[PDB]
Structure formats: structure tokens, C-alpha cells
Amino acid sequence: DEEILEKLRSIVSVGDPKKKYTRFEKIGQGASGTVYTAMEVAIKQMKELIINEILVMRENKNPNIVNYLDSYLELWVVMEYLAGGSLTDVVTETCMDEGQIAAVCRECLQALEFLHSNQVIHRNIKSDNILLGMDGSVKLTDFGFCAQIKRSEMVGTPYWMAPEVVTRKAYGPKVDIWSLGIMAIEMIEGEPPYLNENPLRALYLIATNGTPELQNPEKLSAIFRDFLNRCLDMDVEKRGSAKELLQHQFLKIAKPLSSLTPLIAAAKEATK
């Protein structure tokens, strides 16, 4: 209703975006809207959720969060451009080693530590929401499902949701730790657990089986298996916080972020 639209209109910038930005080039299509490149920036063209998202993004700037630049009123959102694409492209088309996985996990944990200390829960951590820079920069985006703080809304993407979310229990920031654990499984196996199943049967599987099992756990080092176990603990109090996990031994084997640029080149070659 008009009252929420007025609040949204008071938040967006005024002036012609067609006059501030040039060289529009379409680079994608999805559920939300159409993504363009301009001058380098990335512009997504598409109620109370759009307000929460713009507000949370302006208020929570961090080097491990894609920079929100501007918005215009149908609704255009201007972000920094990360030319290396998404982590999804890398996870589905390449074999990442433990040093590369640890580098990505560390970057994601730094973004989560920042968010959780600012009482923000992302609730939609997945490889699709991780953007890569041409230098190997790792950044988090899509704050549409975020909540400012316990919660009990069944919010997220089925395959990456924590059991306490799926079962509609009072939950906290550690739901993002579980989702990161699922994203580390994506990095290992190419997919989150139960992707072959329909989203509802995955929800039942998360609620009944709990901690998912790896297809080949013997292939992982002892320190990596432990890191995953701390991410995917059933008991929320036992599950590690972002601050605690930043000190885990697994992150000490992290390779420089430059080690990710051959993966970006491989993903770009596979998806052409």
C-alpha cells in the first residue's frame, strides 16, 4: 500500500539513472530481475522487504559484502561489479582444493562475523550469493531474506536451511554457520546435500536426518572434517560462532585469494 511505497520512494535516489550511468549491457535473468553492467557497476532492474534490504545494505558496509551504491525508482539497484561471477559457477565446474575452500570460508566468516556483531542474520548463505572479483575477492550479497535481531520464520533456500529453521524453532545467527557448512559441501561435491530431491523432500530430510553426510568423507583431511562438523552441529550451542570459527585450524591452510583466479577462468570456459 501507498504508505510503504512512500517510505520506499523516500529511500531511493532522485535524478535520471540513464543520465548518470552509460554502456548498459545485459548479463543475466532471474526470479528478482534483470542484471546489467554499466560505467564499472552492476545494476539490477526489477514490499517492506525491499525497504529492509536497502536499509540493511547501506548500514552494513564491509570489505566482504558487495558494495551497495545507489537505488532508483521499476526499481534499479546499483552495486559494485564483481567480474569473476558467482561461486556457483566455480563449485559446479571445477575441483577446488582444501587451500582454496579454506580461503573462501575465511572470507565468508569475516562477512558473517561483521553481520552477527551488527545483529543481522543473512538467512540465505549459498554459493549463488557469493560473488568473485578478478583478483580473487570473495564478497557476500542478497540481503532480501535478512533479519535484524530469536526468529522462527521458515525463510531461506531449502537445501541450505538449518534444521532449527526447517522445524520452525526459535533460531539465531548460527543458522548462517550451518548454511556456510552446506556451501563448503557444495565446494567439495559440487552440490548441497539432497539436490536430486524435490525442495519439500529435502526439507523433510534436513528435519529427520539432521547433520548431512559426505559422499566420500575419507577424501578430506582431519582438520577439514572437524571444521565441517563444527559448522553442521545439530546442537546450536555446540555449533561454532563466526568469531570462533575464524580461529579454526582449517583456515590456517588457506591459500592466497589469487589461487581462485584459475578457477574463475575454468568456470568462464565451462559456461561459455
Ligand SMILES: O=C(c1cc(CO)ccc1Cl)c1c[nH]c2ncc(-c3cnn(C4CCNCC4)c3)cc12
Ligand atoms: O546481480 C547482482 C546483484 C545482486 C543483488 C542481490 O539481491 C542486488 C543487486 C545486484 Cl546488481 C550483482 C551485484 N554485483 C554483481 N557483480 C557481478 C555480477 C555477475 C557477473 N557475472 N554474472 C553472470 C551470472 C550468470 N551468467 C552470466 C554471468 C553476474 C552480478 C552482480
